[PDB]
Amino acid sequence: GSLTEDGLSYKEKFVVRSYEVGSNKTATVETIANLLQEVGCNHAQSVGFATTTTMRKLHLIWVTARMHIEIYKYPAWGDVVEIETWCQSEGRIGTRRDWILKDSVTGEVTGRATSKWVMMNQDTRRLQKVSDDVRDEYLVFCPQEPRLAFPEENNRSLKKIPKLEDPAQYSMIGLKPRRADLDMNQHVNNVTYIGWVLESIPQEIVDTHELQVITLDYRRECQQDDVVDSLTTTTSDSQFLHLLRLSGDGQEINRGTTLWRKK
Amino acid sequence: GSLTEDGLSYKEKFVVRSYEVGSNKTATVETIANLLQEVGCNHAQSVGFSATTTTMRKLHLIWVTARMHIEIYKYPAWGDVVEIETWCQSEGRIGTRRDWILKDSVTGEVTGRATSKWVMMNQDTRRLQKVSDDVRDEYLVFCPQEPRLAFPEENNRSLKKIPKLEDPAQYSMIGLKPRRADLDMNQHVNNVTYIGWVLESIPQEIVDTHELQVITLDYRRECQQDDVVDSLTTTTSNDSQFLHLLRLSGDGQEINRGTTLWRKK
Numbered sequence: 037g038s039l040t041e042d043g044l045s046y047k048e049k050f051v052v053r054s055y056e057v058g059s060n061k062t063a064t065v066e067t068i069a070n071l072l073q074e075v076g077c078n079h080a081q082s083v084g085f086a087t088t089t090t091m092r093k094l095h096l097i098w099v100t101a102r103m104h105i106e107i108y109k110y111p112a113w114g115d116v117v118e119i120e121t122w123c124q125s126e127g128r129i130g131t132r133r134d135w136i137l138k139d140s141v142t143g144e145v146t147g148r149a150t151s152k153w154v155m156m157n158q159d160t161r162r163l164q165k166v167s168d169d170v171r172d173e174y175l176v177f178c179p180q181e182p183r184l185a186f187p188e189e190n191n192r193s194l195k196k197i198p199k200l201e202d203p204a205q206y207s208m209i210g211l212k213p214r215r216a217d218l219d220m221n222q223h224v225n226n227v228t229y230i231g232w233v234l235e236s237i238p239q240e241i242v243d244t245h246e247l248q249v250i251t252l253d254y255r256r257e258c259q260q261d262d263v264v265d266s267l268t269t270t271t272s273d274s275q276f277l278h279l280l281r282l283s284g285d286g287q288e289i290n291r292g293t294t295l296w297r298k299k
Numbered sequence: 300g301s302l303t304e305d306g307l308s309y310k311e312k313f314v315v316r317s318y319e320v321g322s323n324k325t326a327t328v329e330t331i332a333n334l335l336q337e338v339g340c341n342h343a344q345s346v347g348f349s350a351t352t353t354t355m356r357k358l359h360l361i362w363v364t365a366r367m368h369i370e371i372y373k374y375p376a377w378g379d380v381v382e383i384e385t386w387c388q389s390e391g392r393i394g395t396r397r398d399w400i401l402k403d404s405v406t407g408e409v410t411g412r413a414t415s416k417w418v419m420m421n422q423d424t425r426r427l428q429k430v431s432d433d434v435r436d437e438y439l440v441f442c443p444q445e446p447r448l449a450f451p452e453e454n455n456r457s458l459k460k461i462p463k464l465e466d467p468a469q470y471s472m473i474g475l476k477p478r479r480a481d482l483d484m485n486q487h488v489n490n491v492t493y494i495g496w497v498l499e500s501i502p503q504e505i506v507d508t509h510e511l512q513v514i515t516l517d518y519r520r521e522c523q524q525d526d527v528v529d530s531l532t533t534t535t536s537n538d539s540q541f542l543h544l545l546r547l548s549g550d551g552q553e554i555n556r557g558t559t560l561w562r563k564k
């Protein structure tokens with residue numbers, strides 16, 4: 037793709053592939069999650085990167101604290117979907133990355149996503165409050181005035197997610213990441229947690245409904261040799277409360293909510 | 300992409316994506332396997348298919364992969380453009396064969412090649428049958444009439460007999476289950492998943508010091524969504540060779556068998 041005229045956002049067109057679609061002949065939420073990740077890497081690369089030299093000398097990385105995705109229409113196999121992405125500062129809390137999905141032919145907004153990222157030491161794993169020198173190097177690539185994919189007053193991207201109480205209504209136990217679930221740094225990518233969360237949704241709901249919204253809170257990183265339990269309870273359109281936790285000790289790694297519409 | 304000038308093969312260029320590369324910053328064998336599958340689907344679509352013919356749909360017949368063989372010389376890096384050319388051929392009444400050539404779009408050098416053998420089967424009864432004369436004429440108008448082989452060699456490793464891994468296996472990955480992302484548009488476990496499952500029993504040490512040069516996979520039975528697989532490996536060998544076996548966790552029913560060849564980095 038390419039940066040837009042002002043250089044304050046990035047655009048890319050993707051053609052949906054045969055292996056990227058589900059039983060309805062449209063792209064899966066995991067293909068969409070992969071495309072958002074891909075368009076965000078190319079934006080970081082096109083502006084010289086998403087770690088800066090200040091963060092490299094300090095062993096600092098950006099970790100996803102929260103992801104929220106709303107899809108109105110899923111692209112079909114062979115369709116061209118255009119994605120626009122941009123970053124923003126959230127004071128000393130961290131950074132935010134937003135996405136808008138469109139039909140390349142009609143120009144209609146077919147989806148949108150927002151994610152909150154926090155600073156962390158690659159080694160000690162502790163969340164740092166973002167300094168001042170780090171703002172003076174990534175604000176020259178962010179829009180100065182606020183630009184939100186979910187601007188709405190009191191929207192569902194900033195909702196407090198409760199913890200799923202036992203017993204869960206539904207569950208998928210013994211989930212292990214394989215080598216294909218790890219990225220170039222050998223860490224389990226954030227798209228795998230989405231797939232793991234959806235594994236505990238009954239095949240009946242999947243066959244009769246379409247996923248409209250998903251909000252995912254990341255608490256702990258899952259390692260390659262870890263085993264995950266996926267838990268779901270209907271809270272309702274169909275709404276679900278979700279929880280990913282380690283098979284052994286029951287250590288919480290993720291919590292979220294999904295919203296499904298009838299087909 | 301597009302069909303070549305003669306309409307007897309299809310070409311497509313792919314840019315390698317960030318989530319498609321491994322720890323070495325180059326495409327995984329599963330990304331390559333996905334790209335071959337994708338370029339084969341667009342070739343079938345470009346010549347009027349949906350890869351079943353009108354006689355095949357009339358009789359509930361499908362093409363199933365009996366064998367896959369892939370040899371990679373150089374793996375494309377993240378951001379590289381890899382061009383893939385594919386074509387089909389009739390193998391008498393046995394079935395069909397699909398071949399692939401992988402190239403660097405910039406230098407034009409062959410960086411890999413693959414071959415697969417497909418057999419005819421009833422979708423419902425799962426009974427493999429010989430290709431009839433009517434089906435053969437419907438797909439011979441889209442195939443090169445003279446032989447065109449990605450592995451023409453008189454002693455190639457794509458027609459090798461694979462033995463069955465004897466117990467105890469040297470290495471193993473137990474309790475592998477396919478998720479919804481492992482199933483295709485027809486709800487069947489995608490062929491690429493078996494490749495990932497076969498490689499799960501290779502020690503992380505071999506993966507970190509070697510690169511996969513060759514893989515040959517024999518498909519015996521289809522794995523269902525609610526099935527559980529056991530992946531088994533034994534070293535048979537600068538080059539490291541392995542014998543592989545996928546089997547059902549329960550009864551020990553064979554679903555796959557294969558061999559891999561790895562070279563030092």
Ligand SMILES: O=C(O)COc1ccc(F)cc1
Nearest residue numbers: 099100101161254255256257
């Ligand atoms: O690796 C760990 O243990 C910490 O993971 C986190 C992930 C996301 C967070 F917002 C905070 C922490």
Ligand SMILES: O=C(O)COc1ccc(F)cc1
Nearest residue numbers: 363364365425518519520521
């Ligand atoms: O579903 C079954 O039991 C049969 O699966 C096969 C798969 C690949 C083959 F080459 C032959 C058979």
